[PDB]
Amino acid sequence: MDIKYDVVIVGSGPIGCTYARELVGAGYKVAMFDIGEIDSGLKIGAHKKNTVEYQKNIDKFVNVIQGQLMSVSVPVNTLVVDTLSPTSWQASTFFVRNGSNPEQDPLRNLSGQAVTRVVGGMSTHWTCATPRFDREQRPLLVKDDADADDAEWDRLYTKAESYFQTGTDQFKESIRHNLVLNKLTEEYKGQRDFQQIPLAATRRSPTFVEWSSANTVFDLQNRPNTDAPEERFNLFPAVACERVVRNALNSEIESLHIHDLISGDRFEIKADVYVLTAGAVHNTQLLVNSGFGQLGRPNPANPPELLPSLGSYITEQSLVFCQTVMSTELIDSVKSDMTIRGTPGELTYSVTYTPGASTNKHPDWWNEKVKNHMMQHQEDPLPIPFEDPEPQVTTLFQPSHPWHTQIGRDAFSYGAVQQSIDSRLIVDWRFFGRTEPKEENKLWFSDKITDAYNMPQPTFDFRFPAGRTSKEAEDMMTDMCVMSAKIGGFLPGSLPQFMEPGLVLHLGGTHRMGFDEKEDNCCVNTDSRVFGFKNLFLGGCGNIPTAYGANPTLTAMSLAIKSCEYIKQNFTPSPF
Amino acid sequence: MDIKYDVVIVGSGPIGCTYARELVGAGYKVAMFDIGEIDSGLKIGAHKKNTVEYQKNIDKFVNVIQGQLMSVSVPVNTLVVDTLSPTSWQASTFFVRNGSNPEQDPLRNLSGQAVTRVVGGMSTHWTCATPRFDREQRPLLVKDDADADDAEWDRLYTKAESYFQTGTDQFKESIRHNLVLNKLTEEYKGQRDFQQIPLAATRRSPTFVEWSSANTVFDLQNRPNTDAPEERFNLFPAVACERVVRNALNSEIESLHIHDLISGDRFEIKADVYVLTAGAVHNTQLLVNSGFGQLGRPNPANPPELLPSLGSYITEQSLVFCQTVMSTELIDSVKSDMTIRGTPGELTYSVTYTPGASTNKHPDWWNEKVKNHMMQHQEDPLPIPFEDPEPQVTTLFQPSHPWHTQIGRDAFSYGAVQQSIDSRLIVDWRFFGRTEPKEENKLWFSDKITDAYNMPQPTFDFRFPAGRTSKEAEDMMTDMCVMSAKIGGFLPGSLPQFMEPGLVLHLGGTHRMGFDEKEDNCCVNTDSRVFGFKNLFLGGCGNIPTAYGANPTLTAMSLAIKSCEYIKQNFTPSPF
Amino acid sequence: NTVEYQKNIDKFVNVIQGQLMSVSVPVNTLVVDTLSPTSWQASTFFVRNGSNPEQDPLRNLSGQAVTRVVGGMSTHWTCATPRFDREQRP
Amino acid sequence: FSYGAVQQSIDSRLIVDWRFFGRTEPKEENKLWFSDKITDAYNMPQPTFDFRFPAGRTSKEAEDMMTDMCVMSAKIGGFLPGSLPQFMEP
């Protein structure tokens, strides 16, 4: 560890890795600090799903996800357990216990919000969906010139797509995927377009997909090294960043205060530039601990010195979910091109098709896979092959259906895992709604209660706004119900429902971007630079100030990229 | 990867690693293959609990366990789902779905049995309890000489204990541990002895314990390296070992057939010596796939060629579990020595005690902790400090209480963890019963059905033997109820119950050891060598042939140590 | 038609439950494998608690039930009495 | 006739129940028959069902019916957790 770096980046998620790739790339002397530790194997911060065992036993990966999601804010528990033995110790009140947050109102929480503290951050477990926002979801990076704004977005997005290895081809040969995609297309012809979810992933084999992660962006190995002898990068894991120190004029950051979690030591690190990419919640906490915004319960009569909007206008998307069991009609359509004769399990049984026939509803590869499955597994009642990959279908946000949709099998399942109905039949439905930014919706931090890292406890004051937000949300529920009945009926146990506020984990706007601090009620400009401050930059979902439905990580990468352009224009790397 | 080595080891668990430590160190060119991958972080095969994040969020670790425990044998599901939509595809029969085993009788299963395919095996998640077996649980290593037998076992156990870094003082200054230890000691004074569970762990700081793992035994780093310039070791993860090739004469293994899961290729690796430490079930699978024992549903009418005892006489322990909520008396007794002034929360509150008074019921280290907790947390109604370690208490197996006890807090919780009752009040109780070895209790492998690695499906035919085993399992149950009541009443949601057979993962006897193949109905001798074969060695709990109550891993490591002496005497390493 | 039920409408479900007897219940095959080893334990799923061995669990009307009291099901019914239109009417 | 534990967290003044009942085509294959071996609680022949909702119209209307409840109910309110849209036991 040095005293002095060109850039210091807080957090090693896919956004801090975008800063590193770009800046380590341009020859800056870079350090990265993460509170969490390396635990994805030898590929530092790689996706935990990239092991043969997980992709053979995909129902188990939910436990990984759960094991690294720590709830942000848990109100104090008021369940009545009144069947204790009379000898057992009991309290006469519902006291603060098991780490609960007494500031938190149970009825205005994002009870589902959680954070992850591991190198690679949430990108070690995430679903890899990386859609672009269209104009209506997207921040303006140029006022008054929609084409120049368009041009700038597309250039950033294409570059961001290349860091993540985003593609829309990795599921093209799944029967199940094409079954669903084709029926949805047919049933909505013209009115909605369907496609593969764009995914940051590469297919290694029919049974294996290399899911992208922060490691894909930048491999997080220390440099110089044989492969980049001219580059300078050090990752320090198990290091909690506590505070940035402001100069008296509030125009410059002067140091980063850290705590080595293993040695217990505390340091002050000097850099030319300080980049904070610790998550939409922990960026906020870091700032507030450093005198930005306002510690404690919001009070308007006490107007904050720096960044009045910090932690206001927060957005989290609505989520509705269900699972369906494929219709008989759809399962029978899988074998539509086949001539089936005799009795399965007997030597006279056959199943054949006519290759090339233009009246075949399916291409030859489909019919070959069905034929083989049906002939080698005569004991199974379904035409679907056993290792068939899941669907990954989307119809993207449009003004007429202003929500995002994911139709397939997500590794993050919500209940006990059903065993009675065959998996091949089951389709997941997830519709994500956009939420209006409102000043009243807040993340703020206790001045008295602290977290497990002795930082100020985050606390939420949130309700989905009335008006458009609530109307679209129930219109979204209805849409899911309508659309999903095209594929089949609901799975008992996975009936249509809203999920817990924040389980979806696309929290935005906690440190939101705008052209004008005051006019646009915001904390960073369109270079992601904190207003006032020459050398402090925020990355991540916290920056997005608009109401969006799609998954945000791509877009936040795109912003980080344009942040790094600004850095390169204003700060000179130290000579190697 | 070479075509030839001196030794090849299958499986990177702690037995695998025991063989590696011995033979690498003695200069043999060794290669170890594991079907699972390095995930655990930069210390290969290290314990997953060893992160700052899991030791602050100890209730999350159950998610890591569940995440890498894959059920061995699931019978065909017969749950009725009769609220499907009538458009949905409906089964006419209870067909084979979701990887289930149609061979398995659901009424004679070890349904909680599971396996783990990661480098380091189950020692990446285990609880690290490492007691010795007493005579009554232990197999004889010397005939007709009880004291020679004890001496050899003491020699081996001492060595194993150094390898694992077993200790009995890691929890010596925990109030909870000592609170429970003292009450039990007193209530059974002169009748039973209570001590800390022997743990493979090293305490690093008051809030952090470095749990031991396979990594502790052997660091799995390829050699030579700087720390070891004349050793030769290579670890090949993501390689499925599928068969050991017997010579036609049945006296020698000629090669190991492997499947590299990443490239998809197959190879044949030669060695001088072959060691199987794939785990009790999978050592048995791999042998049965290579021609030992009998493939398919057992048939007396046809005799196995080789190792007719293979997969018979299997033992699994009964397990009874509950949780308790600490008595008012015991909680009150925690602050017995304190003098308290004023009223909590004001500048007037004072809590003090007198170091060394022999009115004091507790020591100084205890009172100082309570004091500091009560002064710094005056809102809190409990005098137990917040970061106080869990109890880790046992009374070891004896003739009048022939069961193992662990009392404290296990990471392997078996219901959703309640948040209503303060965690500091809860104590777990687990009593482990011994099971008589019987020929009829069996692990066998199907000749048609395969598992996800395309190996023969494992199937159990098991029932806890009537007579002593059943009588004791019920007596155990009762003792747990009687004992636990001295500490407090039951926690609702964790009432006294038997766990699902096999849930304890202490399976043994599947490839069991003895002096003679026939008289002792066994598969390996006391050098762990397979009868008939010069150069095939088995390690693990499957070797243990007796009825045991306590955690088997140290005993199985002991065996491997003895096995390595033989190997060292009877095979010469290739030149460097 | 008691004042007590009309003031505690939530409780009336129990009256209904009290008098609906299942017509045909298949033989149960739920696995309970956490019995004490000393407890008497089935080797098969045999005909238990008045179940019907003739009944295919997968081609049942499991919710079907009968009431045996004077007044029959009219002692508990919801009292909804619509006419059928032609489409539904013999 | 409520179907689970009566939830108590939500003011019952707010709660509206939706039930939509579909029609079923008569098919000779759908039968109630009686065992000549097994007998019920009063020593009469045990009733047994062989029943599946017919494919075709009965099925298509069932699922169209379920959508119509979703679509209609949403005019009045969102679903009450624990009483989400479901088909009930036949």
Ligand SMILES: *Cc1cc2c(cc1C)Nc1c([nH]c(=O)[nH]c1=O)N2C[C@H](O)[C@H](O)[C@H](O)COP(=O)(O)OP(=O)(O)OC[C@H]1O[C@@H](n2cnc3c(N)ncnc32)[C@H](O)[C@@H]1O
């Ligand atoms: C968990 C999850 C996440 C997402 C998906 C599903 C699941 C279950 N799927 C999904 C996601 N996003 C999408 O775009 N598409 C998908 O299909 N998920 C969200 C995605 O995972 C996140 O948006 C993305 O990682 C955010 O990137 P980031 O801004 O780089 O933030 P991270 O949270 O990943 O990591 C920040 C990081 O910093 C650390 N940290 C926290 N506090 C400190 C302090 N004080 N000092 C130093 N370091 C700090 C972390 O430990 C962490 O690594």
Ligand SMILES: *Cc1cc2c(cc1C)Nc1c([nH]c(=O)[nH]c1=O)N2C[C@H](O)[C@H](O)[C@H](O)COP(=O)(O)OP(=O)(O)OC[C@H]1O[C@@H](n2cnc3c(N)ncnc32)[C@H](O)[C@@H]1O
């Ligand atoms: C899961 C668990 C286990 C234990 C405790 C708690 C819980 C939650 N507690 C514990 C236990 N043991 C004790 O002695 N003390 C207690 O506190 N647990 C059990 C203990 O973990 C095991 O007994 C021990 O690891 C067994 O060691 P081993 O014989 O070396 O077995 P492993 O299962 O650890 O690893 C073998 C291994 O080989 C692989 N494998 C399997 N098949 C193949 C094939 N065909 N080719 C190559 N490799 C293969 C695996 O991937 C695995 O790593």
Ligand SMILES: *Cc1cc2c(cc1C)Nc1c([nH]c(=O)[nH]c1=O)N2C[C@H](O)[C@H](O)[C@H](O)COP(=O)(O)OP(=O)(O)OC[C@H]1O[C@@H](n2cnc3c(N)ncnc32)[C@H](O)[C@@H]1O
């Ligand atoms: C239980 C129930 C029933 C109805 C509603 C609510 C619920 C929970 N709601 C509903 C009703 N139908 C409507 O049209 N609209 C509504 O809002 N329910 C159904 C209605 O309750 C029935 O259709 C009606 O009672 C049928 O009348 P029934 O043809 O007269 O038949 P019952 O079952 O009422 O009475 C028959 C009766 O005969 C007896 N019995 C049975 N076996 C024997 C033998 N072997 N010997 C002599 N007597 C026998 C009974 O004990 C009973 O009293």
Ligand SMILES: OC[C@H]1O[C@@H](O)[C@H](O)[C@@H](F)[C@H]1O
């Ligand atoms: O709850 C799971 C969901 O969580 C969001 O973060 C993801 O973007 C979706 F892909 C989906 O996996």
Ligand SMILES: OC[C@H]1O[C@@H](O)[C@H](O)[C@@H](F)[C@H]1O
């Ligand atoms: O089921 C929980 C138990 O699991 C066994 O494998 C362990 O040996 C016990 F220490 C305890 O952790």
